[PDB]
Amino acid sequence: GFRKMAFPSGKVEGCMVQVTCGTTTLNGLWLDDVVYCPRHVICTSEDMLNPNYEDLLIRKSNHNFLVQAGNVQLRVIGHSMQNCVLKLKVDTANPKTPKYKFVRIQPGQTFSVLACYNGSPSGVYQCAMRPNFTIKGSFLNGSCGSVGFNIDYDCVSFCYMHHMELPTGVHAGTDLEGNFYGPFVDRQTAQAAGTDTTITVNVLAWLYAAVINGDRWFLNRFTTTLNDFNLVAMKYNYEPLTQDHVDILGPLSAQTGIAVLDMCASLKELLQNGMNGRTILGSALLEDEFTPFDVVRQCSGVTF
Amino acid sequence: GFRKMAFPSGKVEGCMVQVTCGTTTLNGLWLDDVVYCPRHVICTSEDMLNPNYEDLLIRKSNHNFLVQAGNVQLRVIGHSMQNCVLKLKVDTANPKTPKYKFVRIQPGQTFSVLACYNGSPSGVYQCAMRPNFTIKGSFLNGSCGSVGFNIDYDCVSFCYMHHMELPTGVHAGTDLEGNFYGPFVDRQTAQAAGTDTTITVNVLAWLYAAVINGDRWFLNRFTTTLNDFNLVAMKYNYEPLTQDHVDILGPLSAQTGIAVLDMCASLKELLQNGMNGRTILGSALLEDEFTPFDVVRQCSGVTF
Ligand SMILES: *[C@H](O)[C@H](C[C@@H]1CCNC1=O)NC(=O)[C@@H]1[C@@H]2[C@H](CN1C(=O)OCc1ccccc1)C2(C)C
Ligand SMILES: *[C@H](O)[C@H](C[C@@H]1CCNC1=O)NC(=O)[C@@H]1[C@@H]2[C@H](CN1C(=O)OCc1ccccc1)C2(C)C
Ligand code: NA
Ligand code: NA
């Protein structure tokens, strides 16, 4: 009774366009009269090693940029660089432009990715921004410019644009102002993500989902303190739990009649003892990709 | 590098409407001038125990059916019953009607569900039709009339409409002609799904995905026969593997240079020996919700 659910993708689908510069094709985001795409579209293979993007952009003409919106070729009348994103001003506003915001998300928060190739949607899935500011996505060559988003009421909040894959096979990208999440740079060099930690508040959310869905074996009759729990958290590379985390879990706490520090005590035992070959919500591992809001949305059936 | 991916849901989002009959509200599918919804919308609580649907439908007037398409109230000018579905003919054709087909899917095949409440999309996720003709969905009260679908090229293939939850917490529903998948009836009585089996051909697909994504520990230097494998399959409640299954896996076989009967031998060892606390594509259990086509689509990046 509990699934990894993406937001409906319709409002974003109408914004996806193709952006080609020589042999290099990727996706763009067409909002009002502006197409946002990764700046590495202006790069040839050789200059991806240490590109001088300012110098490369100067060499570019509007006409070097082939922007298609399905069958339509869309006429670029201008180009500018904001951090690691290119803004291609176009002669036509997107008539399918939804109501939108650009937001910078926090590590631990979730969003939907609309994976595109050649400006066409392939698929939609839910992602978490890892504590080390990577995402564990499914992106191939051509996936760049694919976007991550949340929907609140009738408003699309864009939070991610895809730029690259790291050696570990995880993914990195920017906010829609072109500021990388984490320490990453848009050039083809070996780059280390931090050690990643498990998103403790999300694991608690998901244990609450497990209880709501009648799956309770792991509950014990013990409590604990933020202090003592955080000692075990540190030992298993779990993020420390703050009183903010405890306050955000209050609704799930109240719904289930299980105090947050009581759930923490249950999590302690799972980390120390493993799951003994048992499953929780049909998983053999502790899941950390569901925020407290994701759990509440899916158990209370919120719409858009 | 491998995720449970849903189809983009835009084309389906434009078809979802609200259908209310007394205190009973659920979702409808508005295609051309017809709204398709579960027939149990005409039911009061008491008559859900053993409804005479023919007699109940006779008592109904067009005006008993409140059909809203967002802010629009849509005027029902007719009602008919096809098996377990109600066709509410309306005065306006859906101007957002996509190109579509109604298809009856086979056990083992996957589809995207667009979970709706009050005619508004909440979320999208990928499902498999279990061998026992159930789905393991996330559906609350009000979710009925939510639809399952595939997209081929520019065509939406509707294959599922949601009707009910079984005692086990799994879900049952119909094709869009109102024929239940499996032995289920739309009345509030205890109903047994069969014993469910694991979709062997999908587990093989997913092991191929694991190899393509560099995750290979489980490969062994052994082969086997359909005959000998099916003896182990039967013992672990896996579906028997047919030469059709072997032919469908040919592309993944050819891509990886691993013969289907060689992968089967690897699966044999996993079933007999467990995973020794190892993970495959970040899972501690064998996944059976990915068809060979799903794997090929996601590793080759097919679009719509
Ligand atoms: C944009 O489509 C593309 C997406 C990558 C390619 C494979 N999976 C992805 O997520 N981004 C890039 O190609 C960037 C780009 C150059 C290299 N880079 C990158 O991801 O390097 C790793 C890579 C490349 C190709 C195949 C596998 C791995 C710069 C400018 C950062
Ligand atoms: C239609 O919205 C609704 C969806 C169920 C309710 C909870 N989760 C679901 O998938 N379908 C029904 O209510 C049908 C209907 C009557 C009963 N039934 C049903 O699912 O019974 C089980 C149930 C009901 C409510 C809450 C939990 C479980 C008939 C006519 C088959
Ligand atoms: Na131009
Ligand atoms: Na009417």
XYZ file of C-alpha atoms and ligand atoms in Angstrom:
672
model
C 0.000 0.000 0.000
C 3.069 2.351 -0.318
C 4.960 3.190 -3.577
C 7.742 5.628 -4.746
C 5.322 8.093 -6.479
C 6.334 10.894 -8.923
C 4.303 14.094 -9.449
C 2.166 14.135 -12.563
C 4.506 15.422 -15.286
C 2.092 17.068 -17.772
C 2.913 20.731 -16.892
C 6.668 19.995 -17.378
C 6.250 17.877 -20.546
C 4.907 20.987 -22.392
C 8.202 22.856 -21.572
C 10.786 20.275 -22.870
C 12.646 21.217 -26.112
C 15.710 19.934 -27.984
C 18.934 22.053 -28.094
C 21.681 21.110 -30.566
C 25.115 22.744 -31.110
C 27.157 20.752 -33.690
C 27.192 16.999 -32.846
C 26.125 17.929 -29.214
C 22.347 17.485 -28.515
C 20.622 17.901 -25.104
C 17.300 19.049 -23.553
C 16.099 22.580 -22.768
C 13.331 24.094 -20.546
C 11.146 26.527 -22.547
C 9.397 28.974 -20.081
C 7.888 32.254 -21.467
C 10.394 33.455 -24.162
C 13.545 31.734 -22.634
C 15.116 28.215 -23.118
C 17.320 27.201 -20.116
C 19.928 24.465 -20.809
C 23.329 23.305 -19.510
C 26.132 25.629 -20.753
C 28.246 22.558 -21.803
C 26.053 22.415 -24.998
C 28.528 25.043 -26.472
C 31.462 22.617 -25.878
C 33.294 20.424 -28.445
C 34.685 17.090 -27.073
C 38.288 18.490 -26.719
C 37.395 21.655 -24.706
C 35.232 19.661 -22.136
C 38.580 18.872 -20.328
C 39.040 22.541 -19.120
C 36.566 24.756 -21.002
C 36.918 28.583 -20.842
C 33.132 28.992 -21.111
C 33.254 32.850 -21.398
C 35.632 32.558 -24.439
C 33.599 29.672 -25.936
C 30.277 31.628 -25.610
C 31.836 34.689 -27.328
C 32.664 32.498 -30.409
C 28.946 31.391 -30.598
C 26.227 32.890 -32.838
C 22.453 32.571 -32.153
C 22.327 30.526 -35.422
C 24.782 27.861 -34.020
C 21.843 26.843 -31.616
C 19.233 24.460 -33.176
C 16.222 24.570 -30.742
C 13.211 22.331 -31.740
C 9.858 22.127 -29.810
C 8.628 18.848 -31.328
C 8.157 19.607 -35.095
C 8.695 23.430 -34.541
C 12.176 25.021 -35.022
C 12.218 27.882 -32.409
C 14.306 30.991 -33.400
C 17.049 31.990 -30.869
C 17.274 35.819 -30.859
C 19.759 35.980 -27.947
C 22.108 33.986 -25.632
C 23.455 34.769 -22.087
C 25.251 32.712 -19.322
C 24.024 32.574 -15.672
C 26.539 30.441 -13.681
C 26.443 26.968 -15.371
C 23.207 27.615 -17.368
C 22.646 29.131 -20.827
C 19.542 31.282 -21.355
C 18.552 31.125 -25.094
C 16.004 33.974 -25.603
C 13.483 32.877 -28.351
C 10.980 34.822 -30.595
C 7.915 32.832 -29.315
C 6.705 32.515 -25.685
C 5.726 28.897 -24.724
C 1.893 28.941 -24.882
C 2.000 25.825 -22.545
C 4.077 27.768 -19.907
C 2.755 26.619 -16.499
C 2.817 28.772 -13.331
C 6.371 28.163 -11.912
C 9.087 29.081 -9.344
C 12.865 28.324 -9.322
C 13.855 26.907 -5.883
C 17.123 25.634 -4.427
C 16.295 22.471 -2.480
C 17.929 21.273 0.737
C 19.876 17.952 1.056
C 17.351 15.246 2.077
C 14.410 16.714 0.078
C 12.755 14.778 -2.792
C 11.667 15.782 -6.299
C 10.372 14.218 -9.539
C 12.747 13.915 -12.551
C 11.292 14.013 -16.084
C 14.029 12.124 -17.995
C 14.128 13.451 -21.620
C 16.203 12.613 -24.768
C 16.149 14.936 -27.875
C 13.519 17.156 -26.155
C 11.040 14.215 -25.764
C 9.960 12.889 -22.333
C 10.990 9.191 -21.800
C 9.879 8.751 -18.129
C 9.233 10.147 -14.631
C 10.628 8.961 -11.260
C 11.109 10.323 -7.713
C 14.682 11.267 -6.505
C 16.202 12.485 -3.216
C 19.044 15.091 -3.109
C 21.597 12.994 -1.149
C 23.349 14.644 1.861
C 26.502 14.775 -0.408
C 24.443 16.774 -3.036
C 24.336 13.939 -5.608
C 21.254 12.179 -7.030
C 20.928 8.408 -7.804
C 19.202 8.856 -11.148
C 18.789 7.001 -14.446
C 20.363 9.251 -17.101
C 22.043 8.285 -20.419
C 23.914 10.363 -23.036
C 21.493 13.068 -24.250
C 19.699 13.264 -20.801
C 21.309 16.651 -19.950
C 18.816 19.527 -19.408
C 16.284 17.018 -17.954
C 14.692 18.783 -14.853
C 13.648 17.893 -11.304
C 10.533 19.521 -9.816
C 7.834 19.554 -7.154
C 4.154 20.651 -7.649
C 2.475 22.722 -4.838
C -1.238 23.419 -5.554
C -1.034 24.569 -9.270
C 2.630 25.775 -9.196
C 5.660 23.820 -10.637
C 8.757 24.400 -8.441
C 11.833 23.604 -10.621
C 14.781 22.608 -8.361
C 17.205 20.587 -10.604
C 18.696 20.543 -14.067
C 20.893 17.548 -15.002
C 24.546 18.142 -16.034
C 26.734 15.068 -15.424
C 27.574 11.593 -14.144
C 30.350 11.081 -11.523
C 32.803 8.123 -11.460
C 30.620 6.358 -8.842
C 27.693 6.366 -11.380
C 25.727 8.998 -9.341
C 24.570 12.300 -10.907
C 25.141 16.056 -10.339
C 23.482 19.185 -11.605
C 22.389 22.686 -10.821
C 19.431 24.746 -9.638
C 17.704 26.665 -12.503
C 19.995 29.680 -11.763
C 22.908 27.351 -12.728
C 24.483 26.955 -9.261
C 25.752 23.367 -8.830
C 24.450 21.391 -5.881
C 27.636 20.364 -4.026
C 31.314 20.946 -4.938
C 31.007 19.909 -8.657
C 32.197 21.735 -11.799
C 31.003 21.234 -15.393
C 34.264 19.901 -16.793
C 35.427 16.383 -17.590
C 37.730 15.722 -14.610
C 37.557 13.099 -11.800
C 35.452 14.678 -8.948
C 34.780 13.263 -5.426
C 31.334 13.407 -3.822
C 31.606 13.391 -0.012
C 30.974 10.310 1.970
C 27.231 9.972 1.751
C 25.099 9.501 4.814
C 21.605 8.073 5.213
C 18.808 10.654 5.615
C 17.696 9.706 9.161
C 14.513 11.819 9.225
C 13.356 10.145 5.969
C 14.075 6.600 7.367
C 11.845 7.567 10.379
C 9.130 8.887 7.986
C 9.198 5.521 6.112
C 9.045 3.487 9.400
C 5.918 5.621 10.200
C 4.534 4.649 6.697
C 5.294 0.998 7.612
C 3.217 1.302 10.859
C 0.317 3.152 9.071
C 0.378 0.203 6.559
C 0.074 -2.354 9.426
C 3.784 -3.377 9.262
C 4.930 -3.164 12.926
C 7.283 -6.041 13.941
C 10.246 -3.635 14.419
C 8.462 -1.512 17.132
C 10.037 -2.055 20.593
C 8.910 -0.755 24.062
C 12.071 1.477 24.443
C 12.711 5.264 24.150
C 16.050 7.185 23.738
C 17.359 10.792 23.480
C 18.508 12.825 20.436
C 21.957 12.750 22.176
C 22.172 8.901 22.560
C 20.528 8.164 19.185
C 22.994 10.587 17.385
C 25.890 8.524 18.874
C 24.530 5.412 17.053
C 23.588 7.530 13.951
C 27.257 8.754 13.696
C 28.487 5.110 13.945
C 26.234 3.953 10.982
C 26.831 7.121 8.804
C 23.257 8.322 9.437
C 22.701 12.132 9.454
C 22.301 13.518 12.991
C 18.618 14.115 14.008
C 17.751 17.722 15.151
C 14.684 19.019 17.121
C 13.582 20.463 13.716
C 13.503 16.800 12.421
C 11.490 15.829 15.549
C 9.002 18.759 14.959
C 8.572 17.818 11.220
C 7.710 14.198 12.284
C 5.026 15.442 14.792
C 1.994 14.734 12.519
C 3.123 11.117 11.805
C 3.957 10.740 15.544
C 0.413 11.956 16.494
C -1.336 9.834 13.765
C 0.312 6.549 14.880
C 0.504 7.308 18.645
C 4.304 6.582 18.526
C 6.579 9.360 19.981
C 9.499 10.308 17.635
C 12.099 9.220 20.277
C 10.249 5.844 20.556
C 10.534 5.330 16.741
C 14.241 6.370 17.027
C 14.740 3.505 19.583
C 13.203 1.045 17.048
C 15.620 2.405 14.339
C 18.576 1.978 16.801
C 17.776 -1.794 17.136
C 17.402 -2.261 13.345
C 20.844 -0.619 12.782
C 22.543 -2.648 15.558
C 20.748 -5.974 14.758
C 19.888 -5.865 11.018
C 16.441 -7.018 9.807
C 17.044 -10.822 10.493
C 15.955 -11.466 6.836
C 12.597 -9.665 7.508
C 11.092 -6.994 5.164
C 9.457 -3.606 5.879
C 6.977 -2.366 3.229
C 8.340 -5.188 0.999
C 11.973 -3.948 1.282
C 14.965 -5.770 2.875
C 16.849 -2.401 3.335
C 15.953 0.799 5.255
C 14.605 3.350 2.701
C 15.651 7.044 3.033
C 14.096 8.528 -0.194
C 10.678 9.394 1.380
C 10.382 12.753 3.263
C 7.794 13.113 6.092
C 5.751 15.245 3.610
C 5.970 12.476 0.911
C 4.625 9.931 3.455
C 1.779 12.305 4.634
C 0.876 13.214 0.964
C 0.647 9.487 -0.023
C -1.234 8.279 3.177
C -3.607 11.372 3.110
C -3.946 11.406 -0.774
C -3.082 15.121 -1.466
C -3.744 16.231 -5.132
C -2.637 19.100 -7.504
C 21.812 3.911 -12.959
C 18.443 1.989 -13.016
C 15.083 3.252 -11.596
C 11.360 2.159 -11.604
C 10.262 4.727 -14.274
C 6.625 5.681 -15.115
C 5.505 6.988 -18.532
C 5.000 10.726 -18.724
C 1.399 11.243 -17.579
C 0.396 14.485 -19.369
C -1.863 12.880 -22.050
C -3.797 11.011 -19.285
C -3.966 13.968 -16.850
C -6.136 15.884 -19.401
C -8.717 12.993 -19.327
C -9.283 12.689 -15.505
C -12.681 13.946 -14.187
C -14.635 13.643 -10.927
C -17.837 11.489 -10.788
C -20.149 11.811 -7.772
C -23.402 9.919 -7.002
C -24.723 10.880 -3.520
C -21.957 10.625 -0.858
C -19.959 8.363 -3.325
C -17.165 10.214 -5.254
C -14.594 8.590 -7.608
C -12.584 9.317 -10.800
C -13.667 9.054 -14.444
C -11.833 8.875 -17.834
C -13.190 11.510 -20.267
C -12.379 10.405 -23.906
C -14.311 12.047 -26.827
C -17.938 12.448 -25.534
C -17.826 9.502 -22.979
C -16.795 9.301 -19.239
C -15.786 5.717 -18.220
C -15.942 4.946 -14.458
C -16.444 1.959 -12.129
C -20.148 0.923 -12.013
C -20.010 0.773 -8.145
C -20.413 4.629 -8.199
C -24.245 3.943 -8.423
C -24.079 1.935 -5.139
C -25.150 3.038 -1.618
C -23.125 1.486 1.284
C -25.842 -1.181 2.039
C -26.207 -2.547 -1.548
C -22.351 -2.975 -1.999
C -22.776 -6.366 -0.150
C -24.657 -8.003 -3.135
C -25.651 -5.258 -5.594
C -28.137 -6.031 -8.425
C -26.393 -3.519 -10.711
C -29.011 -3.807 -13.547
C -31.827 -2.889 -11.054
C -29.697 -0.140 -9.437
C -28.852 1.446 -12.862
C -32.566 1.467 -13.841
C -33.349 3.593 -10.702
C -30.658 6.171 -11.800
C -31.263 9.427 -13.720
C -28.556 11.272 -15.741
C -28.990 14.118 -13.172
C -27.966 11.807 -10.221
C -24.367 11.879 -11.797
C -22.256 14.977 -10.863
C -19.298 14.944 -13.363
C -16.745 17.838 -12.939
C -13.673 18.443 -15.219
C -11.766 20.754 -12.854
C -14.014 23.884 -12.491
C -16.390 22.690 -15.343
C -19.608 20.725 -14.535
C -19.989 18.348 -17.572
C -23.638 17.472 -18.534
C -24.438 13.693 -18.633
C -26.935 13.114 -21.487
C -26.862 9.294 -21.198
C -25.700 6.264 -19.118
C -25.025 2.589 -20.133
C -23.265 -0.439 -18.448
C -20.504 -2.496 -20.179
C -19.525 -5.361 -17.797
C -18.234 -3.598 -14.611
C -17.886 -0.114 -16.229
C -20.385 2.748 -16.600
C -20.248 4.841 -19.784
C -21.619 8.375 -18.999
C -22.219 10.029 -22.430
C -21.602 13.850 -22.065
C -22.608 16.925 -24.213
C -18.944 18.057 -24.742
C -16.092 16.025 -26.317
C -12.772 16.294 -24.349
C -10.713 18.790 -26.412
C -7.573 17.260 -24.685
C -8.523 13.706 -25.913
C -5.213 12.010 -26.832
C -4.865 9.269 -29.486
C -5.729 6.032 -27.540
C -6.444 2.250 -27.604
C -8.102 -0.024 -24.973
C -5.918 -3.149 -24.439
C -6.189 -6.162 -22.144
C -2.701 -6.804 -20.763
C -1.138 -10.179 -19.979
C -0.008 -11.261 -16.447
C 3.655 -10.182 -16.044
C 3.325 -6.971 -18.139
C 3.906 -3.499 -16.613
C 1.996 -0.214 -16.856
C 1.942 3.279 -15.306
C -0.850 4.179 -12.816
C -2.004 7.813 -12.547
C -3.419 7.811 -8.983
C -6.266 10.414 -8.796
C -8.629 11.665 -6.009
C -11.725 13.849 -6.844
C -10.679 13.895 -10.547
C -7.240 15.460 -9.734
C -3.943 13.616 -10.392
C -1.943 12.980 -7.134
C 0.950 10.869 -8.573
C 2.349 8.397 -11.130
C 4.124 5.049 -10.534
C 4.931 1.844 -12.469
C 2.977 -1.416 -11.650
C 3.146 -5.049 -12.826
C -0.023 -7.189 -13.341
C 0.896 -10.057 -10.957
C 0.513 -13.667 -12.253
C -2.585 -13.876 -9.916
C -4.084 -10.785 -11.741
C -3.661 -8.401 -8.773
C -1.596 -5.188 -8.623
C 0.509 -3.960 -5.625
C -0.607 -0.344 -5.835
C -1.012 2.682 -3.562
C -4.739 3.512 -3.602
C -6.892 5.155 -0.876
C -10.662 5.792 -0.634
C -11.626 7.931 -3.658
C -8.860 6.343 -5.890
C -11.411 4.304 -7.919
C -11.489 5.105 -11.678
C -7.710 5.829 -11.571
C -6.220 4.211 -14.800
C -3.150 2.204 -15.815
C -1.589 2.798 -19.246
C 1.364 2.401 -21.591
C 2.499 4.945 -24.280
C 3.691 3.570 -27.701
C 4.973 6.350 -30.027
C 2.128 8.979 -29.616
C -0.655 6.513 -28.589
C -1.941 5.973 -24.965
C -2.863 2.281 -24.438
C -5.294 2.156 -21.452
C -5.120 -1.315 -19.803
C -6.457 -0.849 -16.200
C -9.153 0.919 -14.245
C -9.048 0.619 -10.429
C -12.045 -0.913 -8.577
C -11.046 -2.397 -5.198
C -8.672 -3.519 -2.456
C -8.505 -7.218 -1.394
C -8.025 -8.456 2.214
C -4.273 -8.935 1.559
C -3.997 -5.150 0.779
C -3.410 -5.810 -2.986
C -5.652 -4.249 -5.674
C -7.997 -5.467 -8.462
C -9.685 -3.808 -11.385
C -10.812 -4.133 -14.947
C -9.774 -3.449 -18.531
C -11.540 -0.370 -20.038
C -14.306 -2.705 -21.373
C -15.035 -3.501 -17.675
C -13.800 -7.124 -17.625
C -12.059 -7.841 -14.290
C -8.496 -9.101 -14.408
C -8.657 -12.400 -12.478
C -11.596 -14.040 -10.641
C -12.797 -10.846 -8.809
C -16.309 -9.351 -8.573
C -17.272 -5.763 -7.679
C -19.051 -6.549 -4.425
C -17.961 -6.255 -0.807
C -17.239 -9.923 -0.001
C -13.989 -11.701 1.040
C -12.228 -12.787 -2.243
C -9.059 -14.945 -2.640
C -6.326 -14.069 -5.136
C -4.402 -17.193 -6.199
C -1.058 -17.992 -4.786
C 1.153 -15.463 -6.484
C 4.315 -16.465 -8.258
C 7.396 -14.446 -9.174
C 7.597 -13.315 -12.825
C 10.740 -15.270 -13.830
C 11.266 -13.585 -17.218
C 11.193 -10.150 -15.501
C 13.744 -11.282 -12.809
C 16.042 -12.345 -15.735
C 15.461 -8.953 -17.465
C 16.494 -7.161 -14.215
C 19.627 -9.389 -13.774
C 20.508 -8.311 -17.384
C 19.994 -4.624 -16.256
C 22.325 -5.394 -13.303
C 25.075 -6.661 -15.708
C 24.600 -3.683 -18.144
C 25.031 -1.438 -15.016
C 28.345 -3.187 -14.116
C 26.789 -5.245 -11.256
C 27.996 -8.824 -11.975
C 28.999 -10.748 -8.790
C 26.087 -13.228 -9.204
C 27.254 -14.466 -12.691
C 28.576 -18.069 -12.525
C 30.290 -20.209 -15.258
C 27.323 -22.717 -15.399
C 24.452 -23.314 -17.897
C 21.146 -25.281 -17.444
C 18.026 -26.299 -19.451
C 14.463 -24.878 -19.429
C 13.500 -28.359 -18.058
C 15.975 -28.357 -15.076
C 15.531 -24.635 -14.313
C 11.655 -25.040 -14.278
C 12.102 -27.759 -11.583
C 13.815 -25.152 -9.321
C 11.352 -22.398 -10.481
C 8.375 -24.614 -9.358
C 10.074 -25.159 -5.942
C 10.460 -21.332 -5.316
C 6.975 -20.368 -6.752
C 8.598 -18.779 -9.827
C 6.559 -18.876 -13.091
C 7.845 -21.530 -15.519
C 10.112 -20.102 -18.307
C 8.987 -20.858 -21.944
C 10.989 -20.631 -25.248
C 8.870 -17.467 -25.874
C 10.484 -16.000 -22.658
C 13.923 -17.070 -24.001
C 13.195 -15.399 -27.435
C 11.992 -12.124 -25.739
C 15.304 -12.007 -23.738
C 17.414 -12.429 -26.965
C 18.337 -8.704 -27.332
C 19.553 -8.443 -23.682
C 21.344 -11.820 -24.137
C 23.112 -10.496 -27.308
C 23.938 -7.055 -25.735
C 25.648 -8.571 -22.648
C 27.111 -11.698 -24.342
C 25.345 -13.881 -21.678
C 23.122 -16.735 -23.066
C 19.607 -16.832 -21.465
C 20.243 -20.373 -20.057
C 23.536 -19.062 -18.529
C 21.624 -16.219 -16.752
C 19.034 -18.858 -15.639
C 21.916 -20.828 -13.965
C 22.936 -17.630 -12.075
C 19.254 -17.180 -10.951
C 19.180 -20.876 -9.806
C 22.155 -20.215 -7.419
C 20.599 -16.988 -6.043
C 17.326 -18.871 -5.269
C 19.128 -21.850 -3.663
C 21.774 -19.741 -1.798
C 20.164 -16.317 -1.149
C 22.174 -13.109 -1.737
C 24.564 -13.586 1.323
C 23.597 -10.000 2.406
C 24.746 -8.641 -1.029
C 22.670 -6.189 -3.168
C 21.882 -6.112 -6.914
C 21.080 -2.656 -8.372
C 20.848 -1.453 -4.726
C 18.175 -4.066 -3.809
C 18.474 -6.953 -1.282
C 15.567 -8.859 -3.022
C 15.132 -10.153 -6.608
C 12.927 -7.622 -8.500
C 10.224 -8.945 -10.907
C 8.433 -5.643 -11.867
C 10.686 -4.842 -14.899
C 9.792 -6.499 -18.272
C 12.569 -7.130 -20.863
C 11.058 -4.177 -22.830
C 11.186 -1.906 -19.696
C 14.908 -2.759 -19.267
C 15.686 -2.176 -23.033
C 13.643 1.130 -23.050
C 15.549 2.458 -19.964
C 19.099 1.277 -21.075
C 18.489 2.453 -24.741
C 16.552 5.674 -23.706
C 13.383 5.257 -25.898
C 11.080 8.388 -25.943
C 7.386 9.218 -26.808
C 24.618 15.333 -20.657
O 23.668 14.534 -21.477
C 25.547 14.337 -20.200
C 24.899 13.233 -19.305
C 25.762 12.123 -18.713
C 26.349 11.152 -19.785
C 26.095 9.756 -19.347
N 25.172 9.890 -18.120
C 25.019 11.236 -17.730
O 24.382 11.612 -16.770
N 26.589 15.044 -19.474
C 28.004 14.962 -19.846
O 28.299 14.263 -20.827
C 29.052 15.734 -18.944
C 29.731 16.925 -19.515
C 31.196 16.545 -19.662
C 31.289 15.084 -19.328
N 30.081 14.774 -18.542
C 29.944 13.669 -17.891
O 28.926 13.305 -17.372
O 31.060 12.843 -17.788
C 30.860 11.427 -17.517
C 30.230 10.566 -18.612
C 30.101 10.953 -19.990
C 29.555 10.078 -20.922
C 29.230 8.791 -20.500
C 29.366 8.350 -19.200
C 29.876 9.206 -18.287
C 30.747 17.938 -18.986
C 30.929 19.173 -19.605
C 30.731 17.968 -17.396
C -12.851 2.948 -4.873
O -12.263 4.264 -4.505
C -12.512 2.130 -3.743
C -10.975 1.961 -3.524
C -10.454 1.091 -2.385
C -10.765 1.669 -0.968
C -9.519 1.644 -0.163
N -8.413 1.249 -1.162
C -8.949 0.889 -2.414
O -8.301 0.497 -3.361
N -13.147 0.840 -3.959
C -14.099 0.260 -3.008
O -14.365 0.918 -1.991
C -14.683 -1.177 -3.328
C -16.116 -1.289 -3.702
C -16.790 -2.041 -2.564
C -15.755 -2.194 -1.487
N -14.452 -2.019 -2.154
C -13.335 -2.315 -1.579
O -12.251 -2.046 -2.015
O -13.399 -2.994 -0.365
C -12.261 -2.920 0.538
C -11.964 -1.583 1.217
C -12.878 -0.477 1.288
C -12.532 0.684 1.969
C -11.321 0.703 2.657
C -10.419 -0.341 2.657
C -10.744 -1.462 1.976
C -17.032 -2.445 -4.106
C -18.237 -2.216 -4.767
C -16.179 -3.672 -4.648
Na 18.799 32.182 -34.650
Na -27.599 15.521 -16.620
